[PDB]
């Protein structure tokens, strides 16, 4: 198990997905045209996980870029690292999806999906041992949300034994394109609960607050939020992209993180938060990554309990000190980790730090406090749905009110299920 196939869908999907390929291409010594001008052999040892080798020792991202309009994807080709992506993997429609889940899932996107699956199958075939798929998308618009979840469903049909990962950007009124976002998100969460093994919940609420409160950006752009997203994505893929004892794969992650199959919504965290000169001591990384202020999902982990945790330290540091500090927070806050999964915190260290920082920590948590996120979206949803507001946009593409009711019910069930283990 090595090769992953990456798909990015919609405005958000392709914006954050572009930053991901920018960040990791720098980490693996690949340049804006595709050539390797590195220095360490550790950079190329598992370059195969995310890149294909090409004619002339070029490395080509195993990346499929999907949108229902060409706006965002002409920007990706324009932008700093655009010329690296394989041009056949740009698969785009013309009319877009108007922030409408139904258009993504049932009408506009249905027209386009079979072409995306031909590129998926192309990349899937020239793979020694495919472990799975990761998708970047938001849940709030129509393409990345509705079409994205349509893809997932199709990929599962054709490759029912491979892993499915999402980086799924959850919406907030604090960073809001349209009033129908809670609808779109609730329709997609219903899909994600059934058809993914792992989902990283990137809440835009949490990114806005990190940007505002902790980084002193008064007027935060999507660029400022995506700076935080690509550093988190860099962190939660480190163990796949580098060595050397942890034979870490997506299946192993799924097995150890997910005690119950529907409860696979991970809260990510990063330390230190940036946009420095003083490197952080291991105690500080350990305090910071576990801090609510450093979570990429707007949930207080003190309101819930940690089912499982996976922590990843980057830089040159004492592993003695890393165990000591990781054991200190467990022993000093033991009520917040479930007694009925012994040794639920697993920690790893990797010598290569990220660009900029001498040392950093990335956190992956399956906390029951994630319910707060689904409760927040369940509330915004009901505010509108109890008066059937804005529904005509969805019923005009053939959807029924019963489908909204179903979806509202699955999410509220998810919330009940997370609440069940907080009290056990």
């Amino acid at each position: 198990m090595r090769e992953i196939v990456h798909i990015q869908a919609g405005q958000c999907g392709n914006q954050i997905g572009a930053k991901f390929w920018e960040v990791i291409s720098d980490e693996h010594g690949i340049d804006p045209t595709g050539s390797y001008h590195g220095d360490s052999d550790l950079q190329l040892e598992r370059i195969n996980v995310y890149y294909n080798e090409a004619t002339g020792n070029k490395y080509v991202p195993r990346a499929i870029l999907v949108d229902l309009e060409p706006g965002t994807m002409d920007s990706v080709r324009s932008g700093p690292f655009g010329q690296i992506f394989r041009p056949d993997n740009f698969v785009f429609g013309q009319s877009g999806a108007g922030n409408n889940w139904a258009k993504g899932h049932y009408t506009e996107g249905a027209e386009l999906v079979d072409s995306v699956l031909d590129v998926v199958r192309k990349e899937s075939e020239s793979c020694d041992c495919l472990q799975g798929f990761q998708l970047t998308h938001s849940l709030g618009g129509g393409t990345g949300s509705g079409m994205g979840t349509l893809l997932i469903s199709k990929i599962r049909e054709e490759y029912p034994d491979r892993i499915m990962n999402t980086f799924s950007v959850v919406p907030s009124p604090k960073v809001s394109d349209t009033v129908v976002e809670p609808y779109n998100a609730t329709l997609s969460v219903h899909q994600l609960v059934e058809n993914t093994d792992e989902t990283y919940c990137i809440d835009n609420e949490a990114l806005y607050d990190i940007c505002f409160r902790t980084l002193k950006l008064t007027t935060p752009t999507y660029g400022d939020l995506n700076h935080l997203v690509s550093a988190t994505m860099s962190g939660v893929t480190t163990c796949l992209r580098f060595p050397g004892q942890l034979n870490a794969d997506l299946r192993k992650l799924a097995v150890n993180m997910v005690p119950f199959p529907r409860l696979h919504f991970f809260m990510p965290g990063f330390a230190p938060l940036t946009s420095q000169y003083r490197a952080l001591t291991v105690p500080e990384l350990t305090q910071q990554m576990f801090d609510s202020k450093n979570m990429m999902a707007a949930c207080d982990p003190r309101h819930g309990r940690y089912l499982t945790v996976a922590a990843v330290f980057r830089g040159r540091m004492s592993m003695k000190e890393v165990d000591e500090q990781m054991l200190n927070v467990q022993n000093k806050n033991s009520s917040y980790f479930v007694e009925w999964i012994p040794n639920n915190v697993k920690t790893a260290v990797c010598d290569i730090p990220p660009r900029g920082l001498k040392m950093s920590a990335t956190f992956i948590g399956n906390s029951t406090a994630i319910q707060e996120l689904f409760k927040r979206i369940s509330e915004q949803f009901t505010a509108m749905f109890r008066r059937k507001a804005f529904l005509h946009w969805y019923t005009g593409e053939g959807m029924d009110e019963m489908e909204f009711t179903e979806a509202e019910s699955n999410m509220n069930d998810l919330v009940s299920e997370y609440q069940q283990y907080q009290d056990a």
């Binding site: 009124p173 809001s176 394109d177 505010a383 008066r387 804005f390």
Partner: protein
């Protein structure tokens, strides 16, 4: 692509198309003959201005539009006026005899003589389009052509183009400039027969515009030329999201998602600022906070109603010019604490913002000042139902005695249509009341 076809019906529609298209030409640097120096791609292109203008091989940029009237006098002035070369003669369409302030003649008698010709020409523009977005229909409520031909056209357009989006800019009648006693009948008939076929409808109240011209521009007795120049500015602010590139530019359809919570509730209130004379704008730069604040002054509205005595369902701000998000957010924060803004309990209270960098322009020899920045607010308030109510009362006064009804019945209509239309407006008034009531 994303092409938008404008259809201008009757005198008000036609004369407002002049104002608009004259304005768009100045906005994009298109000369009267149709040439555009700054366009290097000759014969065609994908540029944002191409949503409103096709290119010919000779370098002519040509409005994606059709002017239609049942008498030649108003369109003859486009055929011989400054911009006569801009339009292909087949875009400018006339009959010999008008509807005579009668919805019936505009819809049935004079109207059905020219309707196939109009759809045939609309079709010729629709086939120059690689991805047609929809139509923009400019017409008066009160005229016979504006009311009855438009209704017929809208019906027919729903047949030929399915659910392809249709926006109206509708001129709502006012006593200061009104031409006919029967305008309330025409208004209620067109409103009724158009309501299933229009996706969004910006009403413009001639009185509101008349008052703004007197008050803010110091114009003693405004003509139509005065009003249309102001209207074209508002129309331009709304269509500017379709005509310009921009990092912070939110498309108009995205605003529509927010503006229309149920099919029948599709009447946004517009409010524009600043409307100011050159005399008053000299040494008087108006900041983002001042023009934003001016959007919640109901004297700056396009329809005379009071949003303060009603409830909001959406609030969109379309800024153009020297504007950046920081200033906008600060301005909105100030307004939230200091002004009368109550949303319904089923809407989120966030204001949706869009920004075009191209600053607004002015037509040579006009009354508006050239300003560095400007803003159009589109709100969906229950207050706009006040406008339906005033007009519905005028209709009821006359309809109770059957005044003028014989002129409509003689051209083939029945009393059934009148009461069927009035009950639809009764229901619409009741809908705008229901949405405002809190949930349980």
């Amino acid at each position: 692509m994303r092409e938008c076809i404008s259809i201008h019906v009757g005198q008000a529609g036609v004369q407002i198309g002049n104002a608009c298209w004259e304005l768009y030409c100045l906005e994009h640097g298109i000369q009267p003959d149709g040439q555009m120096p700054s366009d290097k791609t000759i014969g065609g292109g994908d540029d944002s201005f191409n949503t409103f203008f096709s290119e010919t091989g000779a370098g002519k940029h040509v409005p994606r539009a059709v002017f239609v009237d049942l008498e030649p006098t108003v369109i003859d002035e486009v055929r011989t006026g400054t911009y006569r070369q801009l339009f292909h003669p087949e875009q400018l369409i006339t009959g010999k005899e008008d509807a005579a302030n009668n919805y019936a003649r505009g819809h049935y008698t004079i109207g059905k003589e020219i309707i196939d010709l109009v759809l045939d020409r609309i079709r010729k523009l629709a086939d120059q389009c690689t991805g047609l977005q929809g139509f923009l229909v400019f017409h008066s409520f009160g005229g016979g052509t504006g009311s009855g031909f438009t209704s017929l056209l809208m019906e027919r357009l729903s047949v030929d183009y399915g659910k392809k989006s249709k926006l109206e800019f509708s001129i709502y009648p006012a006593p200061q400039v009104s031409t006919a006693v029967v305008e309330p009948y025409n208004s209620i008939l067109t409103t009724h027969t158009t309501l299933e076929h229009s996706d969004c409808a910006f009403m413009v109240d001639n009185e509101a515009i008349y008052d703004i011209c007197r008050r803010n521009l110091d114009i003693e007795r405004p003509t139509y030329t005065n009003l249309n120049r102001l209207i074209s500015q508002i129309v331009s602010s709304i269509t500017a999201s379709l005509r310009f590139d921009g990092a912070l530019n939110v498309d108009l359809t995205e605003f529509q998602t927010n503006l229309v919570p149920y099919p029948r509730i599709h009447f946004p209130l517009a409010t524009y600022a600043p409307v100011i004379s050159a005399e008053k704008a000299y040494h008087e730069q108006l900041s983002v906070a001042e023009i934003t604040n001016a959007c919640f002054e109901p004297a700056n509205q396009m329809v005379k109603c009071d949003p303060r005595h009603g409830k909001y369902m959406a609030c969109c701000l379309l800024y153009r010019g020297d504007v950046v998000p920081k200033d906008v957010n600060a301005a909105i924060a100030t307004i939230k604490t200091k002004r009368s803004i109550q949303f319904v309990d089923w809407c989120p209270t966030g204001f949706k913002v869009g920004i075009n960098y191209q600053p607004p322009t002015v037509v040579p020899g006009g009354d508006l000042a050239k300003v560095q920045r400007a803003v159009c607010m589109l709100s969906n308030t229950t207050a706009i139902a006040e406008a339906w109510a005033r007009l519905d009362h005028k209709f009821d006064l006359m309809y109770a005695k059957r005044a003028f009804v014989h002129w409509y019945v003689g051209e083939g209509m029945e009393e059934g249509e009148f009461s069927e239309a009035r009950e639809d407006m009764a229901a619409l008034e009741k809908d705008y009341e229901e949405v405002g009531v809190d949930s349980v």
